[PDB]
């Protein structure tokens, strides 16, 4: 089912069984993660009605529209503690924004705690009526979207120890090791046509190696940013990254396995495809309703992010020399006292959201809470951030709210590209020795989150806040009166309203 650009999103709890194990989950308009779609100039008005009442998972909510820059609408960006206070059970909040010409493949997810891990997440596609790559494919619709999701048999708040997915969900469906032969997702194609497949990771943690038996993947988009066409057999996708790839249905009519192998999971999930776990079906019209019997490519050409190149306005901003940006920041990641830190500080959410602190009179980073996690950025300048990998629990996929950035230096590469680098909004920091360097221009007044997108790391402190262009933040953003009321309502909630019932 589909949600339109002006619509209501009613959030409820119900039982779900995407892998044949039934447990309670979170539904949006009676559907597990429905598609949100519109056009690049639409004005979105999304009324989010929080009717959640199951105490085994988070009830208060906050929706993030991942990849949208939210210029002038920082109050609708959805990171609780930064842009808003949570929407409380029994209440509604109207988000109003526009893509402002930015087309691409995105996704929406709750930004509150680990609630998105329990299913409050889904694909969001913004179509371009002038798409630059329209000559490259014939079909692009609700049937060419492929979402990847990690799924747990117990509610996220009850996970004890290091999280390990029970299953990989492809378009909401999949199987777990030792589980029943639950229905697999089918992606239908016709021999001779070309399809713009939109691949989205909805993950709370695991990354996947994705490939389709017998077919190549011609990448033409990354994280809502178009690239020169670049063909590969297999790619590694991290939390919240998106790729559009042209699928050329040029093989014999047949059933082909679609494969998404996780880096971790219960009972051997990471190492097998046995019984159709970690799988979906690519079916050519005319093939029987049966399982594929194909096999993966033994020696795949692997996607390397430094091979991706931006199609439009390719050059990285600023002087084309490492360290020659207007503002040059280097962050030191750490893990101390059971908490991740950045430059010695572990992120903890303030009781007054940064945007509300700024609207209330804060004039500089020194006045903002929490102390040690907030970095001020000047207006209209070129920034270069460097975030060396090394810290445990990686690879850590960092994301920046409010901006897309050029990746002048990717993981696994020791070279810099200022002429043509891919532009994206979620980047892997790699492994020990890597020095991922990104660039962006500070053209979007407001407080924006910068943090690891593995939700278990975010909740243990791996986050910082950029207070960008503080002098123009009040003029640029003008939240509705309901926005400021969220905090009053939420601070007044009774203890039974936010209490988490654990399960074993
Ligand atoms: C943080 O710490 C590193 C290591 O001391 C230092 O080199 C870097 O300049 C610091 N970054 C910020 C933004 O303070
Ligand atoms: Cu996200
Ligand atoms: Cu991380
Ligand atoms: Cu975020
Ligand atoms: O996020």
* Nearest residue to 429 (alpha-carbon basis) of 305, 335, 343, 276: 305
What residue ranges in 410-496 does DSSP mark as E strands? 423-424, 426-428, 437-441, 446-452, 463-468
Mutate to test the pocket of ligand 1, among 323, 325, 330 (most ligand atoms within 8 A of CB): 330
DSSP 277: T
- Bond preceding residue 486 cis, omega within 30 of 0: no
Q: How close is the Cα of 305 to the center of ligand 5, in Å?
A: 21
> 64 in ligand 5 pocket by Cβ < 6 Å?
yes
Cβ atoms 196, 226 nearer than 8 A: no
* C-alpha–C-alpha distance, residues 60 and 100, integer Å: 29
> 259 in ligand 5 pocket by Cβ < 6 Å?
no
Query: Experimental method for this entry?
Result: X-ray
Which residue in this structure is represented by tokens 């910082």?
Answer: 464
Mutate to test the pocket of ligand 1, among 332, 373, 383 (most ligand atoms within 8 A of CB): 332
Q: Could you tell me the domains of the chain?
A: 1-132 (2.60.40.420), 133-312 (2.60.40.420), 313-504 (2.60.40.420)
Residue 157 is encoded by which pair of tokens?
Answer: 């708040």
Which residue in this structure is represented by tokens 């029943």?
Answer: 180
* C-alpha–C-alpha distance, residues 88 and 7, integer Å: 19
- Residues with CB under 6 Å of ligand 1 are 329-332, 343
488 alpha carbon, distance to own chain's centre: 29
Taking ligand 2, which is a single-atom ion, which protein residues have CB atoms under 5 Å away?
66, 240
Q: What is the C-alpha radius of gyration for the chain, rounded to an integer number of angstroms?
A: 22
Give every strand in the sheet of 446-452, ordered side by side: 374-377, 463-468, 446-452, 397-400, 426-428
What residue ranges in 112-232 does DSSP mark as E strands? 121-127, 145-151, 167-170, 186-189, 194-201, 208-212, 217-222, 225-232
Mutate to test the pocket of ligand 1, among 331, 342, 377 (most ligand atoms within 8 A of CB): 331
* C-alpha–C-alpha distance, residues 26 and 19, integer Å: 15
Q: What DSSP line would sit under 74-120, residue for residue?
A: GGGS--BTTTBPPBPTT-EEEEEE--TT--EEEEEEE-STTGGGGT-
Cβ atoms 108, 121 nearer than 8 A: yes
Identify the nearest ligand to the CA of 332 by its number: 1
In Å, what resolution does this model reach? 2.2
Binding-site residues for Cu(2+) sit at 66, 109, 111, 396, 399, 401, 451-453, 457
3 state DSSP class of 287: coil
Residue 109 is encoded by which pair of tokens?
Answer: 């997810």
* Nearest residue to 4 (alpha-carbon basis) of 116, 139, 125, 121: 125
């Amino acid at each position: 089912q589909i949600v339109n650009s002006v619509d209501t999103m009613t959030l409820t709890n119900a039982n779900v069984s995407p892998d044949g194990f039934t447990r309670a989950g979170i539904l949006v308009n009676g559907v597990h993660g429905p598609l949100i779609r519109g056009g690049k100039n639409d004005n979105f008005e999304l009324n989010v009605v929080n009717d959640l009442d199951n105490p085994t998972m988070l009830r208060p909510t906050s929706i993030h529209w991942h990849g949208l820059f939210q210029r002038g609408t920082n109050w609708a960006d959805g990171a609780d503690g930064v842009n808003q206070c949570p929407i409380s059970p029994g209440h509604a909040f109207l988000y109003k924004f526009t893509p402002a010409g930015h087309a691409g493949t995105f996704w929406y997810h709750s930004h509150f705690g680990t609630q998105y891990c329990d299913g409050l997440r889904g694909p969001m596609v913004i179509y371009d009526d002038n798409d630059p790559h329209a000559a490259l494919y014939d079909e692009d619709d609700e049937n060419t979207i492929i979402t990847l999701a990690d799924w747990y048999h117990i509610p996220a708040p009850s996970i004890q120890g290091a999280a390990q997915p029970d299953a990989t969900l492809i378009n909401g469906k999949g199987r777990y090791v030792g589980g029943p032969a639950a229905e697999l997702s089918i992606v239908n194609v016709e021999q001779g046509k070309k399809y713009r497949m939109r691949l989205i990771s909805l993950s709370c943690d695991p990354n996947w190696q994705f490939s389709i038996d017998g077919h190549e993947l011609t990448i033409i988009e990354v994280d809502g940013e178009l690239t020169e066409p670049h063909t590969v057999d297999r790619l590694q996708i991290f939390t919240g990254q998106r790729y559009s790839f042209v699928l050329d249905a040029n093989q014999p009519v047949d059933n082909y396995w679609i494969r998404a192998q996780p880096n971790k999971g219960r009972n051997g999930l990471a190492g097998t495809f046995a019984n159709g776990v970690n799988s979906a079906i690519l079916r050519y019209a005319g093939a029987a309703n049966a399982d594929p019997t194909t096999s993966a490519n033994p020696n795949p050409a692997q996607l390397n992010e430094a091979d991706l190149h931006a199609l439009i306005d390719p050059a990285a901003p600023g002087i084309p020399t490492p360290g020659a940006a207007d503002v040059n920041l280097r962050f030191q990641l750490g893990f101390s006292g059971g908490r991740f830190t950045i430059n010695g500080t572990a992120y903890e959410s303030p009781s007054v959201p940064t945007l509300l602190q700024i609207m209330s009179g804060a004039q500089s980073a020194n006045d903002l809470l929490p102390a040690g996690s907030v970095y001020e950025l000047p207006r209209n300048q070129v920034v270069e951030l460097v975030v060396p990998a090394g810290v445990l629990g990686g690879p850590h996929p960092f994301h920046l709210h409010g901006h897309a950035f050029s990746v002048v230096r990717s993981a696994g590469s020791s070279t810099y590209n200022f002429v043509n680098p891919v532009k994206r909004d979620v980047v892997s920091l790699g492994v020990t020795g890597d020095e991922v360097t990104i660039r962006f221009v500070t053209d979007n007044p407001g407080p924006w989150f910068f943090h690891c997108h593995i939700e278990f790391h975010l909740m243990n402190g791996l986050a910082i806040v950029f207070a960008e262009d503080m002098a123009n933040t009040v003029d640029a953003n003008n939240p509705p009166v309901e926005w400021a009321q969220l905090c009053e309502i939420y601070d007044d909630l009774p203890p039974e309203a936010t209490s988490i019932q654990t399960v074993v």
